[PDB]
Amino acid sequence: IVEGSDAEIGMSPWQVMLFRKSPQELLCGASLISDRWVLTAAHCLLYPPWDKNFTENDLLVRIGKHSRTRYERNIEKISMLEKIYIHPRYNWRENLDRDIALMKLKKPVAFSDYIHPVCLPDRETAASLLQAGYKGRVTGWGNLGQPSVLQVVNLPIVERPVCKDSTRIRITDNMFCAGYKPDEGKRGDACEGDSGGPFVMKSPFNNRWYQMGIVSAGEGCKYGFYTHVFRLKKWIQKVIDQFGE
Amino acid sequence: IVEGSDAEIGMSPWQVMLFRKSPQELLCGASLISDRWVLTAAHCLLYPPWDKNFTENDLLVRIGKHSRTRYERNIEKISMLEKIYIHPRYNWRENLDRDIALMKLKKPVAFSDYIHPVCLPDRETAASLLQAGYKGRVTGWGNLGQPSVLQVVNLPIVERPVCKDSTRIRITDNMFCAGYKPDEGKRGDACEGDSGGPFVMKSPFNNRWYQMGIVSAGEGCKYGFYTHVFRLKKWIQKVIDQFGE
């Protein structure tokens, strides 16, 4: 997270540090939605070009953490994954169409002031807060340059016509984009390593935090893309309802 | 369960043997709906006349059992209760109006071919299968006379006008009743000790088993009453959504 700033404690408790088994190395990001359901980006797990064939054994996750380096004892939570699930029609080939994934956990996970999940958006919530001129918050650990604690930057959602012209890739509608125009002088964008992490918005209605997207490709280190979670909700609920036992 | 018969294995896997701590004694029945949510009758827990002030510490439950006496090892499951919740407007005084309760479990519980929950009924499901001339299945361990295994009897739902005339108590609409008319010669009714246990119906639509009621007062050892689960669903969902972490 570039030109970010330090989160205070329990400001995104649905944050999850997706942290590969051997060797000992931070991977992407991820997000907690149920007490066994982590939401992340597929190119974390699946992406032929960088040898990426990540299976359920091979990674753990770390839930309810501030610092990247250290270990909080009895504060944070070490979790294995009982199953991964990449999206069926997921297009690594072209434009990361449907860059989205789910990872069931081994055991369930108890909640605390530091661990807690995020709400997934409903109808009103997603065609109300997604907008021209509105911001959400992308939280993440990737480069500066390295941050001893979890970062948190707030970025503004770039108009459909504008992402399109600015980038070379064909954006589908199962993504949106965000990042500051060079116009102002607020620089700020998800760096690479912050992939899979939650774009969040605080509903003015119920005061609830909602994941609208997932860092698909931040770049930072132009506008960062995100998979348009809401426009792939129908998928999530098929996977959760059917497995998840 | 009188004039019953033996269940085969995993025929009601949402059955739960509500089994008091000291001394070692079967209590009512109960039913599994979520992986931390047991559904039972309040007069199991709360009923001034028979000294009944049962608190969360004082009882465990036993999930995924056939035999009453014995112990199936690695088959069944020993569970404590992290919290009870009697219904707020529950009337022990008069006619057991709203005889219904919920018991959160200590830890969560893994599912098996022998443990599994039951579906709670929706709109169609409850004004479609509740009826004049329709039966469900009340499963239970109480007297014969004692049954070395879990019993299972199927009884028919007695018309509104008929329960009323036959009994002395004012039946509310937050109950219905079932048991055979003396007319036929099929005797059969929930005995006392089978309280709190599930009245179930197999939906002809989705082939799904639904709890419509809870043995409120079987008597057996006249028509057995049941709390009209559906007409108190709204309550369940308030309790589950709000606590249950």
Binding site: M11, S34, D113, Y114, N154, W209 | -
Partner: peptide, 30 residues
Amino acid sequence: EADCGLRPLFEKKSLEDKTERELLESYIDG
């Protein structure tokens, strides 16, 4: 699930983080 997206150190504590206001500055119809 149902108590989601309410951080126990903030929205249950009736508090607000440094920059959550910032977000709310950028909405509201007309």
